[PDB]
Amino acid sequence: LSLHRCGLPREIAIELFQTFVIRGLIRQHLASNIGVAKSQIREKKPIVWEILQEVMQGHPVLLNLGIQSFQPILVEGRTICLHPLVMAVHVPLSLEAQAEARLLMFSHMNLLSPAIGDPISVPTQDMLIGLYVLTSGTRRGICANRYNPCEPFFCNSYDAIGAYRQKRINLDSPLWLRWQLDQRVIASKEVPIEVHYESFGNYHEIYAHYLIVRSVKKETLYIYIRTTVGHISFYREIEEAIQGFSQAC
Amino acid sequence: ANLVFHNKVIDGTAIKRLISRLIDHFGMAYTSHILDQVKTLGFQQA
Amino acid sequence: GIQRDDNGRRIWRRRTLTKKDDMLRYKLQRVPFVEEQVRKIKEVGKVMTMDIERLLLSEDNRFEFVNSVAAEATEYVEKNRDEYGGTKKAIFHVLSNRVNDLGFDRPEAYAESDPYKPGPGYLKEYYT
Amino acid sequence: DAGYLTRRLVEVVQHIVVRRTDCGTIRGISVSPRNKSRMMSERIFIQTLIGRVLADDIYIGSRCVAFRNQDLGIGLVNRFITFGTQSISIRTPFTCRSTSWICRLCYGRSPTHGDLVELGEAVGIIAGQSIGEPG
Amino acid sequence: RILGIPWGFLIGAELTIVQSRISLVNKIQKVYRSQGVQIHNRHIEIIVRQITSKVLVSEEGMSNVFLPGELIGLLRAERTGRALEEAICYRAVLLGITRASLNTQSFISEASFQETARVLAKAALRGRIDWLKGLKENVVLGGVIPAGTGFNKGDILFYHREFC
Amino acid sequence: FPLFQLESADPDFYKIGYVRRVRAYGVEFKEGPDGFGIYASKDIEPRRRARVIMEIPHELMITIRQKHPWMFFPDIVPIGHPIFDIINSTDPERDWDLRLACLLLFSFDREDHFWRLYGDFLPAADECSSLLLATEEDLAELQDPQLVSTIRQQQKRVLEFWEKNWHSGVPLKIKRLAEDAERFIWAVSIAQTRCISMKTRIGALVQDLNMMIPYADMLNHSFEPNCFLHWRPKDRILEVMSNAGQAIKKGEEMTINYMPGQKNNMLMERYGFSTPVNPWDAIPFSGDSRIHLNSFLSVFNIFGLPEEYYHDSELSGDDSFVDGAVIAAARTLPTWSDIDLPPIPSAERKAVKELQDECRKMLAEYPTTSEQDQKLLDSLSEARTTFATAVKYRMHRKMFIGKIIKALDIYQERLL
Amino acid sequence: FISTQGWDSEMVVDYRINEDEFHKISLLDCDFFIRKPPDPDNDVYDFREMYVTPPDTDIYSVPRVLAPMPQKYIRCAMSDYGCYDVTEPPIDAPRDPLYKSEREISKVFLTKHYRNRRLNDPEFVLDFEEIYVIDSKTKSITRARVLVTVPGGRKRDRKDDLLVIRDNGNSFKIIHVGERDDPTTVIEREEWTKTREDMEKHLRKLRDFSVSNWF
Ligand SMILES: Nc1ncnc2c1ncn2[C@@H]1O[C@H](CSCC[C@H](N)C(=O)O)[C@@H](O)[C@H]1O
Ligand SMILES: [Zn+2]
Numbered sequence A: 001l002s003l004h005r006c007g008l009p010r011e012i013a014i015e016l017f018q019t020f021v022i023r024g025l026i027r028q029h030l031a032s033n034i035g036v037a038k039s040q041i042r043e044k045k046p047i048v049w050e051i052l053q054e055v056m057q058g059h060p061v062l063l064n065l066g067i068q069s070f071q072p073i074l075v076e077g078r079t080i081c082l083h084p085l086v087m088a089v090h091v092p093l094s095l096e097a098q099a100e101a102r103l104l105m106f107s108h109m110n111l112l113s114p115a116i117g118d119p120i121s122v123p124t125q126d127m128l129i130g131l132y133v134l135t136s137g138t139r140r141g142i143c144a145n146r147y148n149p150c151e152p153f154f155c156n157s158y159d160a161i162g163a164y165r166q167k168r169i170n171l172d173s174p175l176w177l178r179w180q181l182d183q184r185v186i187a188s189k190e191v192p193i194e195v196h197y198e199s200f201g202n203y204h205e206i207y208a209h210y211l212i213v214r215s216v217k218k219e220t221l222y223i224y225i226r227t228t229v230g231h232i233s234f235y236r237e238i239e240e241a242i243q244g245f246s247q248a249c
Numbered sequence B: 001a002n003l004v005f006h007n008k009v010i011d012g013t014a015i016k017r018l019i020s021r022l023i024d025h026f027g028m029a030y031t032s033h034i035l036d037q038v039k040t041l042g043f044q045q046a
Numbered sequence C: 001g002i003q004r005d006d007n008g009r010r011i012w013r014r015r016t017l018t019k020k021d022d023m024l025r026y027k028l029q030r031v032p033f034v035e036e037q038v039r040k041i042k043e044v045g046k047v048m049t050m051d052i053e054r055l056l057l058s059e060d061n062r063f064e065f066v067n068s069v070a071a072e073a074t075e076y077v078e079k080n081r082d083e084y085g086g087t088k089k090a091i092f093h094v095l096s097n098r099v100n101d102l103g104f105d106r107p108e109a110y111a112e113s114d115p116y117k118p119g120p121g122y123l124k125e126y127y128t
Numbered sequence D: 001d002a003g004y005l006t007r008r009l010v011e012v013v014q015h016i017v018v019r020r021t022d023c024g025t026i027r028g029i030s031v032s033p034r035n036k037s038r039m040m041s042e043r044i045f046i047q048t049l050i051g052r053v054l055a056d057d058i059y060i061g062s063r064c065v066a067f068r069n070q071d072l073g074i075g076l077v078n079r080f081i082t083f084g085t086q087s088i089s090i091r092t093p094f095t096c097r098s099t100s101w102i103c104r105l106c107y108g109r110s111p112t113h114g115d116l117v118e119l120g121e122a123v124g125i126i127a128g129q130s131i132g133e134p135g
Numbered sequence E: 001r002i003l004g005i006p007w008g009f010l011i012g013a014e015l016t017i018v019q020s021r022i023s024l025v026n027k028i029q030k031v032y033r034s035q036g037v038q039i040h041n042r043h044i045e046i047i048v049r050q051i052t053s054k055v056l057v058s059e060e061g062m063s064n065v066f067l068p069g070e071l072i073g074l075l076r077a078e079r080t081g082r083a084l085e086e087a088i089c090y091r092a093v094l095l096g097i098t099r100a101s102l103n104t105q106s107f108i109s110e111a112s113f114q115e116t117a118r119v120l121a122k123a124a125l126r127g128r129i130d131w132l133k134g135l136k137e138n139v140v141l142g143g144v145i146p147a148g149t150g151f152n153k154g155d156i157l158f159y160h161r162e163f164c
Numbered sequence F: 001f002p003l004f005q006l007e008s009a010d011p012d013f014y015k016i017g018y019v020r021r022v023r024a025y026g027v028e029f030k031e032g033p034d035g036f037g038i039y040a041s042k043d044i045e046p047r048r049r050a051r052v053i054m055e056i057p058h059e060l061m062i063t064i065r066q067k068h069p070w071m072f073f074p075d076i077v078p079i080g081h082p083i084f085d086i087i088n089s090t091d092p093e094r095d096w097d098l099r100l101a102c103l104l105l106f107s108f109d110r111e112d113h114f115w116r117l118y119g120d121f122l123p124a125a126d127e128c129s130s131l132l133l134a135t136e137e138d139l140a141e142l143q144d145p146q147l148v149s150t151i152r153q154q155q156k157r158v159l160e161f162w163e164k165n166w167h168s169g170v171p172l173k174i175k176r177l178a179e180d181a182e183r184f185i186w187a188v189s190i191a192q193t194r195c196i197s198m199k200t201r202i203g204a205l206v207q208d209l210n211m212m213i214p215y216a217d218m219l220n221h222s223f224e225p226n227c228f229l230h231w232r233p234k235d236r237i238l239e240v241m242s243n244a245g246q247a248i249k250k251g252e253e254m255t256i257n258y259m260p261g262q263k264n265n266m267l268m269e270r271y272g273f274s275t276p277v278n279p280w281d282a283i284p285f286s287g288d289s290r291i292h293l294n295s296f297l298s299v300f301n302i303f304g305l306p307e308e309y310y311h312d313s314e315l316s317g318d319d320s321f322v323d324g325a326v327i328a329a330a331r332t333l334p335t336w337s338d339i340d341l342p343p344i345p346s347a348e349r350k351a352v353k354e355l356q357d358e359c360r361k362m363l364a365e366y367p368t369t370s371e372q373d374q375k376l377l378d379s380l381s382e383a384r385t386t387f388a389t390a391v392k393y394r395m396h397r398k399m400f401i402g403k404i405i406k407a408l409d410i411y412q413e414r415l416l
Numbered sequence G: 001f002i003s004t005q006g007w008d009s010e011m012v013v014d015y016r017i018n019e020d021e022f023h024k025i026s027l028l029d030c031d032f033f034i035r036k037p038p039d040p041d042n043d044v045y046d047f048r049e050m051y052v053t054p055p056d057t058d059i060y061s062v063p064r065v066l067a068p069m070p071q072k073y074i075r076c077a078m079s080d081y082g083c084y085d086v087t088e089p090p091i092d093a094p095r096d097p098l099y100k101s102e103r104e105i106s107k108v109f110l111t112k113h114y115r116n117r118r119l120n121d122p123e124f125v126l127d128f129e130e131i132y133v134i135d136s137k138t139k140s141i142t143r144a145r146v147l148v149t150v151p152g153g154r155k156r157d158r159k160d161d162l163l164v165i166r167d168n169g170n171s172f173k174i175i176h177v178g179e180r181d182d183p184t185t186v187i188e189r190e191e192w193t194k195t196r197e198d199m200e201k202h203l204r205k206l207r208d209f210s211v212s213n214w215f
Helices: A010-016 A018-027 A034-042 A047-056 A095-104 A126-135 A157-165 A229-248 B012-026 B028-045 C035-044 C046-056 C062-079 C090-101 D002-013 D042-047 D074-082 D123-132 E008-034 E041-051 E074-083 E097-101 E107-111 E116-126 E135-141 F011-018 F082-088 F096-109 F114-121 F136-140 F145-165 F181-194 F264-271 F293-299 F324-332 F345-363 F370-379 F385-413 G183-203
Strands: A005-008 A061-063 A068-074 A175-179 A194-198 A202-206 A210-215 A221-227 C002-004 D018-020 D029-031 D058-060 D063-066 D088-091 E054-057 E071-073 E090-093 F027-032 F035-040 F051-057 F062-065 F195-202 F205-212 F227-232 F237-242 G022-026 G031-035 G044-053 G074-087 G100-113 G126-135 G140-143 G146-148 G161-166 G171-176
Touching (some): A005 A010, A005 A061, A018 A034, A018 A047, A047 A068, A095 C062, A126 A229, A126 B012, A126 B028, A157 A229, A221 A229, A229 C035, A229 C046, B012 B028, C046 C090, D002 D123, D002 E041, D042 D074, D063 D074, D123 E041, E008 E090, E071 E074, E107 E116, F011 F114, F062 F096, F082 F096, F096 F145, F096 F205, F145 F181, F181 F195, F181 F264, F264 F385, F324 F385, F370 F385, G074 G126, G126 G171
Antiparallel strands (some): A061 A068, A175 A221, A194 A202, A194 G161, E054 E090, F051 F237, G022 G031, G031 G044, G100 G126, G126 G140, G161 G171
């Protein structure tokens, strides 16, 4: 479910929205009057459920931040379905009450709590474990090599993710990623471990998490990040979420 | 989008900080969609 | 300043960046794989959520915005009673009208339908 | 015990609503970052300042770094810590010219909405919930 | 014993009230901060304002304006002191949130909170008027509360043509 | 069947703003010999409300408080910088342009500032039309001693400020801002011609600001604009909004009113340009002969109160004659009015004739005519921008006096 | 013009230099000025006159000199040494950036061109035996002590040698280009050394540590 939606059973929805189903039947002349419109609802005539879906759309309900407003959708079964970050159900009748429910009580304009201004819907429990495992990077040092030592290169992040889908690399296996943006990698503020300086003018700066290739002859500046597909996946998910929302709006 | 590239680990206090910065920078409609995507990613990886 | 050469055509210095902006390379790009996400955003009604936030940026008080929308919605229903309550909701019509008044373009009342419905009688069933 | 306290807390301030833009008060509460008897916590002292509206101008030399009726952001507070800002006068619920209502400037920024608190907000009931709920 | 008329009472009440507010907020925030609970001082200051917003007319202050033992607002007492010398003598009093909830401007709010019979008997004997400014008052009456979306009340030229 | 059937600005001009959240809707930036402009890239249909044309984030602007004390929004001057002392030494009333010029030159020196990039699209010293850059020979072509003396005082004030604050002993971080007087004069010219003053609310603080706003300082002036500026406090964005209900055609220039109610000599002193259709321009008449104000307004379909005079273009059909000059004529001509007393035609003809004679006496003060000035502009090949501006100014005033003679001739006949 | 050689190591001078006759080298805590003889490539240095200033200031003083300096003009290639300060600043104003990425330069290396040849010379190589180091923290300039491990001595093919810089720009070793270490190897060596020490420190307090093996 989306954060702003909830699922209602047919048996609960038809009672909550009966007045609107009756009006929809009369408006579209599927029922002659109020008395006939009641019998079709009574007899579960299948045209009732088509109307119920229509009148429910765009009509929020109040569920009792103990009380919030959601956009209901019809679901199969007999239970009320709520999204994991959340019994009385109220249907606003007047347009004034429907405006307040949609514009003041929806679950996306109340993302901050009034106490100190903290976010309300931070991922928890299994969602949090998934992100932790995803972004726990490669093993290091004596946990990575049995002996003291006295990796694949990917042109872009999509090639690295594609190699992971083909089981060519693991989720936490280290890799080098060609980086064609600015240096925006959060890392310890440290000088290079080693600088390899060729006598023709090119020098390689090896940091703990990235390599920078520079020159005293050209203006080149090439960046390779030592990461995992897990870190790439987490970065892509947020970036594609931002780009997807922008394109859709 | 000028998102920083995190490269160490994302625990509970790190995700809470990121959401608050996303809200202040992008607003609540954007962050609400980001939360839905991040929530889906966490469930799938768990 | 004003210069004309031979044939009377004025000649002038075109202004150019003549300077390096590193924000040009890394910002005018695009992600290619968000088609599914974009289509779900419209399906769940998230577009109007951004529109509501857009309208509230032009409002000093969000409570008078709510009252004004309800007042405009009441006028729609009295004017045309039978067109509202089903696929077209009056409050949704008001919001889309107010976005279009800013010069942007939105479908009327954010109403959309499934084109792959296998004929009458069939209800799309939701996977919880 | 938490519900009984929440009911009493809500009852005592249930009538408090943001009813004016500016009560026009002159007084302010003085806050000092460098008390001579105890090293005050920086983060807590910053949190008690973010969102407050200034009651007087603040100067570093001849330069006004923040104006009267300007709300305090994170950037401004860090500037007062960096330089020798000894006293800051803010508008609080203790300075408003009323006990039956509060104005926007004496309340300050809304936490849920980022801007200055809007007219008509039932901030008394919000304060009652914000203390009762963590009980 | 040091200051004179509307200065001993005025300045003495300011010192007591300012000191009380500082210690009350610190004591409350000491409890929540030791348990890791973060609440903005705004919310606590709103409650404490109601606790420390009243003075008690002293037993010797008798006039046709105030009676001894009367509970009056601090701002009202300050303003009357500047304008009159009619034996306006008062001391700051700390009212607990229960006692402050029974000394409001709405007898309807008090009667629906606690001790309904005592509240209504006193109000009925003096013909008390409730102007319904608060929120719970209007909830009882079933009206629209004065907050949120309820705040601030929510033929010549015809038949005179050319014959042609 | 489909088978059988002003240059665009540098693409990087919009892009540097666009990557920093500048949005333009239905308009394009086009460059010509006379400078930049904003034009409707498509037919902008009317709506019930004003349409958003451009959105400019606050962080891309250079703003300073109109009133003391001088605070900068966003605050870019470091504490202790010597540039604040220079800004702080100015006259609070008169030296707003010096304060903005110091901020502008300081901004060009900052690596991260947007105006380091945006400054390359500002007119250069030989392309800016400000009269602060005008030579004494350019001021000789104005034919206006009052305006000339005003400009000379401005040039003297700007120069003396540079000599006082950019002497030999100042730090290098100050010297490198304005190495020469002409560099500082150019900055003041940019400040005068492009500053936009508005009342803004930033957070909880409402104040008047003098603002350097990129991409909105490309809107040209019109006394009948199709756009207006609107500060959006919640997200700190300056909006350019087209007028509600007004249809804008593709290619139409988008304009704002720089200076409501101001004459051409004020437009020349501030922005270094004038318009022939300025509805506020005045002409000194003796007042001996007066025409009927009510008749003159009705003959030309000028409606509204005197301070809101407008032409009902739908009551004239195709009369292109009535424009801002005729409105200016209504406000500047000697007039009488007696509630509803009608004017005698023979007495009004004597006034019209005497007013036309006085109009021709003023045209005879100018050594050349407005046609001879127009062809002088076409014949130019190596003229300074300010020289052409000075000629356009005197020609516009001649065109205005000539329009009055034409309007009086029409009015005298249409009174029958 | 002026020979600062042999002058005080931290005292201010009475005048303000003309900065366009100098190389300006900007570090985190200072600006370093070395006289620039005119040259089309702008890579000739006159070390007889050098100054150091606090950043973005025009108050000049003689830097500390910890090694003998070149007496004649020399051609040098410049490269900086430092780190990236990638932060996440607080978000005060609308659209305040999510991160800020800045470069912090702590050392600058001036590597002599071999025989002072130009960059566009087809026989251009670097002379790694003559490297001068500017340190921002101490506002000093010194010559690097370089260890040569390439066989060939002074007369060798300089096209084959690789300079390795370690230890915060304090250790300089010239190796043969065939002994180049993989960047992964460099990173993994550092991690193995650190985790090996940390693990032993963790295990030291177990009372059977003295009778146990590493494996
Ligand atoms: N209506 C008008 N007629 C002639 N010049 C105008 C004008 N409106 C604006 N300008 C010119 O535009 C300047 C204001 S800045 C407006 C855009 C400008 N062309 C630029 O390149 O940035 C003024 O100095 C004036 O010279
Ligand atoms: Zn107040």
